[PDB]
Each structure stands twice: as C-alpha cells, then as structure tokens.
Design a protein around this ligand. Sequence first.
Ligand SMILES: [Cl-]
Ligand SMILES: [Cl-]
Ligand SMILES: [Cl-]
Ligand SMILES: [Cl-]
Ligand SMILES: [Cl-]
Ligand SMILES: [Cu+2]
Ligand SMILES: [Cu+2]
Ligand code: NA
Length: 129
Amino acid sequence: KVFGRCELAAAMKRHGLDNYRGYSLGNWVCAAKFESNFNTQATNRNTDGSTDYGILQINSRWWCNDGRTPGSRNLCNIPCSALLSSDITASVNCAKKIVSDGNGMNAWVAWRNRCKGTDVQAWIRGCRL
Ligand SMILES: [Cl-]
Ligand SMILES: [Cl-]
Ligand SMILES: [Cl-]
Ligand SMILES: [Cl-]
Ligand SMILES: [Cl-]
Ligand SMILES: [Cu+2]
Ligand SMILES: [Cu+2]
Ligand code: NA
C-alpha cells in the first residue's frame, strides 16, 4: 500500500504515534516519507547484509526475523514480512519499541539527517487527521 501523506498521518495518530516519547506526528510522517515514500512494501538491503522493511524501514539486524541476517536479533518478535502489510499495526508497535531504546528517533538515520530540526509540522499541515 502506498499511503497518501494525510492518510498516513491520520493512521499513525490513530495508532498512538502523535507525541509518542515526545515526538510530534510530523516527525513520524517526515521519517516515513524519506524512509519509504509512504510505501508499506518498501525493502532495502543494508551494507552489512541486514534489510530494512516497511513504511519505517525497520532493520532485521535487531528488530524482526527475515531468516537471512546472521547474528541478528528479533526484538519485536515478528517476521519482517509482517512489516510490509497494508495494516500498519506491526510497524507502529515495533517502532514504539525502537524509539524507546535510548536514542529516540535518531535510530532512523534519515530522520536525523532530513527531519530533525526542521519544520516537521509542514508534513501534517492542512491534513484532516
Ligand atoms: Cl508527500
Ligand atoms: Cl508535528
Ligand atoms: Cl536471521
Ligand atoms: Cl493501518
Ligand atoms: Cl528523545
Ligand atoms: Cu489502523
Ligand atoms: Cu484521526
Ligand atoms: Na533479525
């Protein structure tokens, strides 16, 4: 599923991301845009051989099992394929664990390099949520 901007903002809000660990909704929308272009089916291989999955590009190195990431963990206790569903529940719940891990949204390098410090409210501007 490729979400529209405001449709994903509304969904992430419904799923409890707005101000989660202090990160306003536009932070999550901005991260999703640059991670996945709002595509739940997005996959990208990392240099180390792990892969990132779904709207928020959750890495198999730590968070999900894909059967091909040596020495990795599965801290969200989910197959990585679950992260590609049109239903964002698994992605959101796993993201909650990630952002609570100590470095907040800096876990998402694209968030750090492209969203942090910027006017992230622009991502939800005009949206019926
Ligand atoms: Cl957009
Ligand atoms: Cl915001
Ligand atoms: Cl594995
Ligand atoms: Cl959903
Ligand atoms: Cl924080
Ligand atoms: Cu929902
Ligand atoms: Cu809503
Ligand atoms: Na893994």
